[PDB]
Design a protein around this ligand. Structure first.
Ligand SMILES: O=C(O)[C@H]1CN(CCCP(=O)(O)O)CCN1
Ligand SMILES: O=C(O)[C@H]1CN(CCCP(=O)(O)O)CCN1
Ligand SMILES: [Mg+2]
Lengths: 338, 236, 97, 334, 51
């Protein structure tokens, strides 16, 4: 229900449930109907039977790991520098040993990484100090790589979701956020009547849907970004389907009531019945039977797990090394025979 | 409010099961390839190579005997590089997994076994309320077992109930929603929390009392509705 | 510039004062021909409106009180411009926002 | 122009209007025909720049442990090695023990020769546990230090060496402003060399200057403080940054133009001062003069490592190589 | 907070105002003083003083 011009005459009239009740086609409105000033000037509302507010729906996309390859922490320049430095150190160690071979290269490789095959240690004092410094440098490099990877993983979190109605992303509409509505309800009236909300109302006017179900379905897909329908319905939808969540806090407190005409001999009796039902516990039973039950709860966003993205690169390199070894075994055997 | 610890299985969180199985199959394939390549006192065996690879994977702590082959050394070096990368990634992921926040039990509210069947549970839930009030009469009229159970937890005084809850002498305090919210908004720290507004039993509101048939009722109701619609209610 | 005012003994020991305000005052004096005689406020407070133990009579204190009484002709100091003080004295265009 | 005035000032002077409410700047020449009330907003000449990552730390690798801790660890290692060698002798040289301890500290990256005995084995185990603890602590502290924030260039309000003599820097500073305006005239009147240098950059239009700054073809944009502040908060992100309000040049404000002798000047001034004191000015500024990124805080970024980041470690390796060469040359004689 | 190294001015600015020269009402110096202040602001004397 909402007051609008007929586009044909200068007389404005209600539409929907409010119009039907005023037109005399119905004597009561038993359905979710928020109590507001605009609709209270024409009909009579009984005492609320369900207190609620306004919330926002969110898709809550599952987190994913941004890491792509094991070379992310170090640029190719650093890899080349270390590759050349290991050879330089091996050559220097070999020269020092000779003056005062593959053994030096094996030792350098086994000290840099943890191969454990670089047997043979230098005996000269200078060679000993060089080996100690090389081991320290390798340890520092490994520690720095691990620390950088840990820092990157810790600081890898999904973008923050909307928090309430005061979020700057909502106050400044763009071409990405939608946050549509039903296009004819208490929400539309509330957003139109607001003084410092013209931008939001103008942005939502071009994307409002026709029913709550369509808006929820669009939100479940990638066509809609947010929904501001209500709280008693959004919470139930989130509980039933944990694919969506409710964000923010209620910003328009109201309640559902029974709509009736101004001159109706049922207002007092209906209000007393509602109060008695609230007091005795009938409303609690109804809520437990129809609302107070869920299927899947919610879980605070936890750190992501390394998927096959981590495998990509590392196992590719392992396979490449195996292929290179299989290709070079024949060449090595031929060279040994020759 | 509680704190929350880390899950017992968190040590397996960093890597998915598929990653572990792929790593095991790759290790087996590498060991077989190395054994085959070794053909071209300490006789080499497939079991010895598998043991060496397994030991060198985690931290090559266990003693192993390196192969005498040429390409075997390159294979071992590549495996060691892969193992170091894997260990660094696992440590980083485990460090990232240790950041955990607080949580709330999220009680349904006067509708779960906690307030209905405490005996068939851990040590019985200690929930109480201030006696000699409307809440006690409402509970007695609507429930009997809960009232009898709570009769032994009569916490006299809102401040006394809060102190008992803070010290652990009580598990839950049942009272008025507005008063509980106001107290939770001023308690030291943030230990005390209140249930969600959507799970309140016997909901009602605060209003203005007028004459039996006074003509100002409609004007007052319209003014209150206008205040609600404008938005001054949130500011207040 | 010589700078006469109290210390801590209510003697008015003349010190020497300088700084941003002194430089601005010197520049203003150069621009428009006029001599000056700087002195410190005896009370030592910027100024506010307070009551008295006697009957309720409005009165200022500090630099504002000294200027209103007539012991000074101009105030050269970090004095903020507000509605309360603007109803009695006149402020120039701000020299520092 | 041609003696007569124009626009709002001209209309107010011509007597067809009493006040001119808007974004009117207060200046000395404009105050000789009309009277200006107390400004309700401050403005001046401001410079807009772009945010820089700034996540480099050549000495970060030494941050986890202080020099005193390192020296104490070295002395403890020497003492432990000496005690172990003495115990082994009592029941193979000192050099072998020190080499073994050094290898143990660095995750046993070298094939050291283990000693024989029981007390020596116990001491080696204790040292291994200590080394494990030390390595874990060092790695944890290094990981903690790897978190870096984003900083903003410090400019002393158009009084930096980058603005007075940009030729000194190899990548000379490129600062520009819209010509044919008050800012260019003020800069030319105040400074001569700076105006001549900036003449090469004459970007026209605020949007063009913003696009140039975002792309990188420009280093700084000099304009009005209020306009720059408004544009900063309505940018796609937080790249654009304006210097603090305390470093603006030629400070002034926006006021209300009134006739010379009107009698409303005092009333309007008092009303504006009351508005300032009560607190409605802050609410108005938040409602109107505030963007998404206006109140944004410095985010935390985790950048990777490159050659310049690894500075010091390579320098340490080079110093060690030079020391080894020097010792080899010296000991070659005896 | 610039010559202590242990004090920090943390927070945003509120109640923006300015420093002015106070005089008695009906004084033959207000207009000239304000004009001099504006001229100093425009010329650059204030910038030199601040530096
Ligand atoms: O009914 C009222 O007039 C007051 C009294 N209420 C006290 C409720 C006491 P209990 O929780 O029922 O024991 C507080 C606000 N409403
Ligand atoms: O003078 C005024 O009344 C207006 C005009 N201003 C434009 C300044 C143009 P430039 O940067 O000096 O080239 C904006 C607000 N004040
Ligand atoms: Mg090792």
């Amino acid at each position: 229900g909402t007051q609008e011009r007929v586009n044909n005459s200068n007389k404005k009239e209600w539409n929907g449930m409010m119009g039907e009740l005023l037109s005399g086609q119905a004597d009561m409105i038993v359905a979710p109907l928020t109590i507001n000033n605009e609709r209270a000037q024409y009909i009579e509302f009984s005492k609320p039977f369900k207190y609620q507010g306004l919330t926002i729906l969110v898709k809550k996309e599952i987190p994913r790991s941004t890491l792509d390859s094991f070379m992310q922490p170090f640029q190719s320049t650093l890899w080349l520098l270390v590759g050349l430095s290991v050879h330089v150190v091996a050559v220097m160690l070999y020269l020092l040993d000779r003056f005062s071979l593959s053994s030096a290269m094996w030792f350098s490789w086994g000290v840099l990484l943890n191969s454990g095959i670089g047997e043979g240690a230098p005996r000269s004092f200078s060679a000993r100090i060089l080996g100690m410094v090389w081991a320290g440098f390798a340890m520092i490099i490994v520690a720095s790589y691990t620390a950088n990877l840990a820092a990157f993983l810790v600081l890898d979190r999904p973008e923050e979701r909307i928090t309430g109605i005061n979020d700057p992303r909502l106050r400044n509409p763009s071409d990405k956020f939608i946050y549509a509505t039903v296009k004819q309800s208490s929400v539309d009236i509330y957003f139109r009547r607001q003084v410092e909300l013209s931008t939001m109302y103008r942005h939502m006017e071009k994307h409002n849907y026709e029913s709550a179900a369509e808006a929820i379905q669009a939100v479940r897909d990638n066509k809609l970004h947010a929904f501001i329908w209500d709280s008693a319905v959004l919470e139930f939808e989130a509980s039933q389907k944990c694919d969506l969540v409710t964000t923010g806090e209620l910003f328009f407190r109201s309640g559902f009531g029974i709509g009736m005409r101004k001159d109706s001999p049922w207002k007092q009796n209906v209000s007393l019945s509602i109060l008695k039902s609230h007091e005795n516990g009938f409303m609690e039973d109804l809520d437990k039977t129809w609302v107070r039950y869920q299927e899947c709860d919610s879980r605070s966003n936890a750190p992501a797990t390394l998927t096959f993205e981590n495998m990509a690169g590392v196992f590719m390199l392992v396979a490449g090394g195996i292929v290179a070894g299989i290709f070079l075994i024949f060449i090595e055997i031929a060279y040994k025979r020759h | 409010r509680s704190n929350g610890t880390v899950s017992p299985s968190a040590f397996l969180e960093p890597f998915s099961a598929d990653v572990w199985v792929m790593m095991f199959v790759m290790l087996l394939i590498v060991s077989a390839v190395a054994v085959f390549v070794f053909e071209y006192g300490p006789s080499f065996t497939i079991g010895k190579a598998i043991w060496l690879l397994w030991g060198l994977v985690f931290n090559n702590s266990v003693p192993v005997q390196n192969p005498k082959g040429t390409t075997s050394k390159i294979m071992v070096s590549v495996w060691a590089f892969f193992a170091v990368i894997f260990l660094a990634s696992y440590t980083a992921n485990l460090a990232a997994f240790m950041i955990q926040e607080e949580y709330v039990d999220q009680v349904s509210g006067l509708s779960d076994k906690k307030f209905q069947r405490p005996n068939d549970f851990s040590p019985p839930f200690r929930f109480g309320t201030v006696p000699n009030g409307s809440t006690e009469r409402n509970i007695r009229n609507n429930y009997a077992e809960m009232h009898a159970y709570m009769g032994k937890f009569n916490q006299r005084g809102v401040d006394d109930a809060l102190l008992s809850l803070k010290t652990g002498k009580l598990d839950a305090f049942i009272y008025d929603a507005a008063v509980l919210n106001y107290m939770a908004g001023r308690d030291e720290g943030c230990k005390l929390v209140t249930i969600g507004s959507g799970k309140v039993f016997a909901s009602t509101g605060y209003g203005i009392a007028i004459q039996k048939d006074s003509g100002w009722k409609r004007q007052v109701d319209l003014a209150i509705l206008q205040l609600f619609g404008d938005g001054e209610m949130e500011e207040l | 510039v010589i700078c006469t005012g109290p210390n801590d003994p209510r003697h008015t020991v003349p010190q020497c004062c300088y700084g941003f305000c002194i430089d601005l005052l010197i520049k203003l004096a150069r621009t428009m021909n006029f001599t000056y005689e700087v002195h410190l406020v005896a009370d030592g407070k910027f100024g506010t409106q307070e009551r008295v133990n006697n009957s309720n009579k409005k009165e200022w204190n500090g630099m504002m009180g000294e200027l209103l009484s007539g012991q000074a002709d101009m105030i050269v100091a970090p004095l903020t411009i507000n509605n309360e003080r603007a109803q009695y004295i006149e402020f120039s265009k701000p020299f520092k926002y | 122009i041609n003696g007569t005035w124009n626009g709002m000032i001209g209309e107010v002077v011509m007597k067809r209007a009493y006040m001119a409410v808007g974004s009117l700047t207060i200046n000395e020449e404009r105050s000789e025909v009309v009277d200006f009330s107390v400004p309700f907003i401050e403005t001046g000449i401001s410079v807009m720049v772009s945010r820089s990552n700034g996540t480099v730390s050549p000495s970060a690798f030494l941050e986890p442990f202080s020099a005193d801790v390192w020296v104490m660890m070295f002395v403890m290692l020497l003492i432990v090695s000496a005690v172990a060698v003495f115990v082994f002798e009592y029941f193979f040289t000192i050099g072998k023990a020190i080499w073994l301890l050094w290898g143990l500290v660095f995750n046993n990256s070298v094939p050291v020769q283990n000693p024989k005995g029981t007390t020596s084995k116990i001491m080696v185990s204790v040292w291994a546990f200590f080394a494990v603890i030390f390595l874990a602590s060092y790695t944890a502290n290094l990981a903690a230090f790897m978190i870096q924030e984003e900083y903003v260039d410090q400019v002393s309000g158009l009084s930096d060496k980058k603005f007075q003599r940009p030729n000194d820097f190899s990548p000379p500073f490129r600062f520009g402003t819209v010509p044919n305006g008050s800012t260019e005239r003020n800069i030319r009147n105040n400074y001569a060399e700076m105006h001549a240098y900036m003449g090469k950059f004459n970007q026209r239009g605020v949007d063009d200057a913003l696009l140039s700054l975002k792309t990188g073809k420009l280093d700084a944009f000099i304009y009005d403080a209020a306009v720059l502040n408004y544009m900063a908060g309505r940018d796609e992100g937080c790249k654009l940054v304006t210097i603090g309000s305390g470093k603006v040049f030629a400070s002034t404000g926006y006021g209300i133009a009134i006739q010379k002798d009107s009698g409303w000047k005092r009333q309007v001034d008092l009303a504006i001062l009351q508005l300032f004191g009560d607190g409605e000015m802050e609410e108005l500024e938040a409602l109107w003069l505030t963007g998404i990124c206006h109140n944004e805080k410095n985010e935390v970024m985790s950048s990777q490592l490159d050659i310049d980041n690894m500075a010091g470690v390579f320098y340490m390796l080079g110093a060690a190589m030079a020391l080894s060469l020097i010792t080899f040359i010296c000991e070659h004689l005896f």
